[PDB]
Amino acid sequence: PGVMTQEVGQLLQDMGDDVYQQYRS
Amino acid sequence: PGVMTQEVGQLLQDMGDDVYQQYRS
Amino acid sequence: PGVMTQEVGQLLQDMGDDVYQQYR
Amino acid sequence: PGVMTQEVGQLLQDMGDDVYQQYRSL
Amino acid sequence: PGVMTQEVGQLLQDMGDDVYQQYRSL
Amino acid sequence: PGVMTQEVGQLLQDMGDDVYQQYRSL
Amino acid sequence: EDELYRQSLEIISRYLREQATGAKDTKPMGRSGATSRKALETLRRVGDGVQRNHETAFQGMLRKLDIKNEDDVKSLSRVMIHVFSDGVTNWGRIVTLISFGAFVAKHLKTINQESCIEPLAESITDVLVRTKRDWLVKQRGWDGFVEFFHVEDLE
Amino acid sequence: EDELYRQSLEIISRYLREQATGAKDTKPMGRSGATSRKALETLRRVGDGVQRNHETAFQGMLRKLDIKNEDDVKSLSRVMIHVFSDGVTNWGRIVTLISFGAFVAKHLKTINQESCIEPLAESITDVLVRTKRDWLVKQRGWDGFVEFFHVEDLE
Amino acid sequence: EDELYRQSLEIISRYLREQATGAKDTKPMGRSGATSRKALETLRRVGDGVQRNHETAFQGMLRKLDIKNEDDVKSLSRVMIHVFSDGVTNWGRIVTLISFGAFVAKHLKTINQESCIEPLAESITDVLVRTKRDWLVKQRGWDGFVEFFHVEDL
Amino acid sequence: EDELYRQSLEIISRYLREQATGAKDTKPMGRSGATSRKALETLRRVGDGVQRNHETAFQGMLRKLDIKNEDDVKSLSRVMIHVFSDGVTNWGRIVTLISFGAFVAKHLKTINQESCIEPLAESITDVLVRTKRDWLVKQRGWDGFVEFFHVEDL
Amino acid sequence: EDELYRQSLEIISRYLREQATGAKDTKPMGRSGATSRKALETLRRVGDGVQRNHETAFQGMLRKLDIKNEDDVKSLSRVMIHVFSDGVTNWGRIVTLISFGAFVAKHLKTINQESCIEPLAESITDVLVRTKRDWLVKQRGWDGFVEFFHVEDLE
Amino acid sequence: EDELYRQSLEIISRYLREQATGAKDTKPMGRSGATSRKALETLRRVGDGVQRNHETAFQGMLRKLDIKNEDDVKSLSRVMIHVFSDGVTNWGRIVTLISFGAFVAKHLKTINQESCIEPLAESITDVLVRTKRDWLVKQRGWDGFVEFFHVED
């Protein structure tokens, strides 16, 4: 209704985890 | 093979004749 | 690969024969 | 992997079958 | 209304004596 | 039954024993 | 041909088979066998009774024979012929041979050799017809069989 | 060309596939709809009964067969043939074979091998029609099956 | 041409478009207007219900499929095929597939890829018609879809 | 304690178990090993040989007994008693009985009644010790069992 | 208070979490550190082998369990007990249980139920520790785990 | 390669090494690790037992042997062979052989000759596998070793 923050959050979550991959070890 | 035949046969005879006498009359 | 052919077969036979007479 | 079509496909199968159970004539 | 066990026993009785006679012994 | 714990469990048993045979010191 | 070998085999095989499995099977006998169905009833009535009476003895006698595969059916043939070796033929001996044959049939199922049961009934029918056909006819076949073991009841 | 085979495969597949599904499919049948439907209803009643009764046993029996996929189906065919090795054919054995098949069908869904369910129904149908067709025609096919398992209604 | 296909496309495209947009369209159909309108209303009822029921599951399922652009729309085709990968076909399985399609459409708008919505509806329409046309004509098309999901009066 | 019992049970239970489970076990024994292991190895040799020699007959004999569950275990006890009913006792008769037990154990596995196997082993261990303990200790127990079935070339 | 429970939970929960995320997490480790990391490495290698071998079967098996939310985890506890109900315990059965537990973990992520991952690992650890404490110690815990699945050789 | 030799050397070397240093290097063993580790545990138990039983005697016996360097290792080989010179072979003599060997290993560490510890384990492993292989296989190798000394719990 409502602003699906859960959706945007999970989207940012995966992008964030990918940024981790690009720069880690 | 067959080592018996006899003994068994004679036993069956008497039993048979007993049955014979049983239903004879 | 099942070497159980005769074993399972006879088991089903006896079970089938019991279904028989239950409905006969 | 890397696209579990069978997995999500099977999940949709169950859900769709439940939907069929819900609306079918009794 | 009961399975005759002497029959099975008598069979095993005979088989056992054959196994005894078999050249494990003598 | 309606709760399939036994079939899955038994299946898991045989899969586990196969693994046991796989890595066991021959 | 040989209408007498047929029916005879049928009656004996029916009896040996049904005594082995446990219960009865395809009731409509083939001849047409009103007589064949009578004889099977008479055979199962009298035969079972005889089997109960000498179950103890049959066990040892059969154990003595030591039957374990089809080649041992021949040893049963030798026994049956020895029963009539004294020249005397009657329904008492004949029906007892079939009762003992039934006792063997159960044994063959116990040792998982059910395939020997039909060759067994065959050998029993063989001996009776091969050696005693004239007596069977003279005693009016299976009708003389039923008539002999018919009990008056009455009342 | 073989109306008996088509109807048999139809009824058996319908029962097995729906036992695998966990819900019943009631949609109309191919040819003789009434007979087949009645047979499917009867098979449901008796078959579910057989399975509830021997569930524990069936579990171990199938376990020993070690069915993993379609290549293990012929192992089932060998078992089915062996069910008729003693010469005796009846509806009890037939419905139990079908009931065990429905049990194998559920297992096939459990191990994600639902594709083998049709070759399963086929081999079950094959054994019955290839080796026991004369018996099935004599027993009036699936009309006799319904008749056999028909149960008294208490009026 | 394929009369069955064209009507299926219009209905599914309309639903997926308005679900993504948020507001019902609701411009009048559309060749065979009556049936098509009834199907959409029916699809709105059952479809939303499926989405409301399996929303949590749908979120994860779609997430695993990793849909970012139109190239990934083709990957959903393999999924839709698998939904029927056992011969089984009913109206429940079909309406669920469409309901998951509407959920994917919303995701596409969320990631600013609305240009993939229309190809998605086409892919959905494709699978339904291509593999189960004989089934669809047998169930009287969308008239049968409406009939199945009709709930008694009162 | 009945020292002959823990050893006898261990040997008979281990044999029946690996015969049923299909794959022989390897674990060390209890008291010290040696003899118990030698007995089990001997039992494998003779026992499997007996089974292969009398598998067909065993199939029907067991079928007649109609063993379905743990209640039917008691029926087997009476079969074991009949083996030594004529007052005769030898190592051949003992190994044949245990061989039949292993055959029964496989059947218990086949019908999903594996919980009856250990009770079966106990019932077999019972008969031997209960009525034939004197004979057993007089034949040097399991050392005599191994000695009897020894056949070695070299 | 129970190092065995704590250590076991770490290894198993580490395995289940990382299998779900897909990201092989290299943030080691805990108290024992050494053995625990070696156990997690062995769990990965061996477990992924089992998961690849029975991926097809695992899918159907978990499908029939119908695990949707937190309450359904209790259904898995019952399964794990049945894995040992025959009294037999070995590293093969224990690791396969963990491998299947990891398979459920992948599934929980799929239906967006990641919050159920930790109770899943806990339930696995419960059954193992509650019911197999003695066997684990007699087999020297997770040192007997690395010892069993050890592969070397070639020079 | 010889599997029996690899296992025996592994077991004997590890025992002599840990008896010398006084530690415990239970790292990943060979392929038949379960047998090897059980055998080593048994060797720890029985071996220490034999040592505490005859330590006073061992001291003088090794002293008389006068072992100073790797040249003197061939002297231990003669002693080892002479143990079986009556044609008799059993686990008692074998475990005693290895027990005395562990006593020599400590002495080698005491006189700063730890380099001779591996050749010592080799020589012990040699006389067993090179000359008594038939008996060892008959007694089921190291499986029979653990079985023989199993007591009790």
From Swiss-Prot, chain C:
Organs and tissues of expression: Weakly expressed in heart, brain and placenta but not in other tissues. Expressed in a number of cell lines, predominantly in those from colorectal carcinomas.
Bilayer-spanning residue ranges: none
Coiled coil: none
Cell compartment(s), UniProt: Cytoplasm; Nucleus; Mitochondrion
Post-translational modification as stated in the protein's UniProt record: Phosphorylated on tyrosine; phosphorylation is probably required for its ability to inhibit TP53 transactivation.
Comment field on protein domains: The HECT domain mediates inhibition of the transcriptional activity of p53.
Disorder noted: Intellectual developmental disorder, X-linked, syndromic, Turner type: An X-linked neurodevelopmental disorder with highly variable clinical manifestations. Common features consist of moderate to profound intellectual disability, delayed or absent speech, short stature with small hands and feet, and non-specific but recurrent dysmorphic facial features such as macrocephaly, microcephaly, a broad nasal tip, deep set eyes, epicanthic folds, short palpebral fissures and a short philtrum. Patients may manifest other features, such as hypotonia, seizures and delayed bone age.
UniProt subunit comment: Interacts with isoform p14ARF of CDKN2A which strongly inhibits HUWE1 ubiquitin ligase activity. Interacts with MYCN, POLB and CDC6. Interacts with isoform 2 of PA2G4. Interacts with NR1D1. Interacts with AMBRA1. Interacts with HAPSTR1. Interacts with HAPSTR2. In hepatocytes, interacts with PAQR3; the interaction promotes PPARA poylubiquitination and STUB1-mediated degradation.
Similarity annotation: Belongs to the UPL family. TOM1/PTR1 subfamily.
Protein name: E3 ubiquitin-protein ligase HUWE1
UniProtKB/Swiss-Prot annotation, chains D, E, F:
UniProt note: domains: The HECT domain mediates inhibition of the transcriptional activity of p53.
Record disease entry: Intellectual developmental disorder, X-linked, syndromic, Turner type: An X-linked neurodevelopmental disorder with highly variable clinical manifestations. Common features consist of moderate to profound intellectual disability, delayed or absent speech, short stature with small hands and feet, and non-specific but recurrent dysmorphic facial features such as macrocephaly, microcephaly, a broad nasal tip, deep set eyes, epicanthic folds, short palpebral fissures and a short philtrum. Patients may manifest other features, such as hypotonia, seizures and delayed bone age.
Recorded family membership: Belongs to the UPL family. TOM1/PTR1 subfamily.
Function: E3 ubiquitin-protein ligase which mediates ubiquitination and subsequent proteasomal degradation of target proteins. Regulates apoptosis by catalyzing the polyubiquitination and degradation of MCL1. Mediates monoubiquitination of DNA polymerase beta (POLB) at 'Lys-41', 'Lys-61' and 'Lys-81', thereby playing a role in base-excision repair. Also ubiquitinates the p53/TP53 tumor suppressor and core histones including H1, H2A, H2B, H3 and H4. Ubiquitinates MFN2 to negatively regulate mitochondrial fusion in response to decreased stearoylation of TFRC.
GN (gene name): HUWE1
PTM remark: Phosphorylated on tyrosine; phosphorylation is probably required for its ability to inhibit TP53 transactivation.
Subcellular location per the Swiss-Prot or TrEMBL entry: Cytoplasm; Nucleus; Mitochondrion
Stated name of the protein: E3 ubiquitin-protein ligase HUWE1
Tissues expressed in: Weakly expressed in heart, brain and placenta but not in other tissues. Expressed in a number of cell lines, predominantly in those from colorectal carcinomas.
Top-level taxon of origin: Eukaryota
Curated annotation (Swiss-Prot), chains I, J:
Post-translational modification: Cleaved by CASP3 during apoptosis. Treatment with taxol or okadaic acid induces phosphorylation on additional sites.
Motif (BH2): 134-149
Short sequence motif named BH3, residue ranges: 39-53
UniProt-reported outcome of changing K27R: Reduced ubiquitination
Induction comment from the UniProt entry of this chain: Expression increases early during phorbol ester-induced differentiation along the monocyte/macrophage pathway in myeloid leukemia cell line ML-1. Rapidly up-regulated by CSF2 in ML-1 cells. Up-regulated by heat shock-induced differentiation. Expression increases early during retinoic acid-induced differentiation.
Effect of K24R: Reduced ubiquitination
Positions bearing the Glycyl lysine isopeptide (Lys-Gly) (interchain with G-Cter in ubiquitin) cross-link: K24, K27
Compartmental location: Membrane; Cytoplasm; Mitochondrion; Nucleus, Nucleoplasm
Short motif (BH1): ranges: 82-102
Complex and partners: Interacts with HIF3A (via C-terminus domain). Interacts with BAD, BOK, BIK and BMF. Interacts with PMAIP1. Interacts with BBC3. Isoform 1 interacts with BAX, BAK1 and TPT1. Heterodimer of isoform 1 and isoform 2. Homodimers of isoform 1 or isoform 2 are not detected. Isoform 2 does not interact with pro-apoptotic BCL2-related proteins. Interacts with RTL10/BOP. Interacts with BCL2L11; may sequester BCL2L11 to prevent its pro-apoptotic activity. Interacts with GIMAP5 and HSPA8/HSC70; the interaction between HSPA8 and MCL1 is impaired in the absence of GIMAP5.
Biological role stated in the UniProt entry: Involved in the regulation of apoptosis versus cell survival, and in the maintenance of viability but not of proliferation. Mediates its effects by interactions with a number of other regulators of apoptosis. Isoform 1 inhibits apoptosis. Isoform 2 promotes apoptosis.
Family that this chain belongs to: Belongs to the Bcl-2 family.
Protein name per Swiss-Prot or TrEMBL: Induced myeloid leukemia cell differentiation protein Mcl-1
Organism: Homo sapiens (Human)
Lineage: Eukaryota, Metazoa, Chordata, Craniata, Vertebrata
Name of the gene encoding the protein in the UniProt record: MCL1
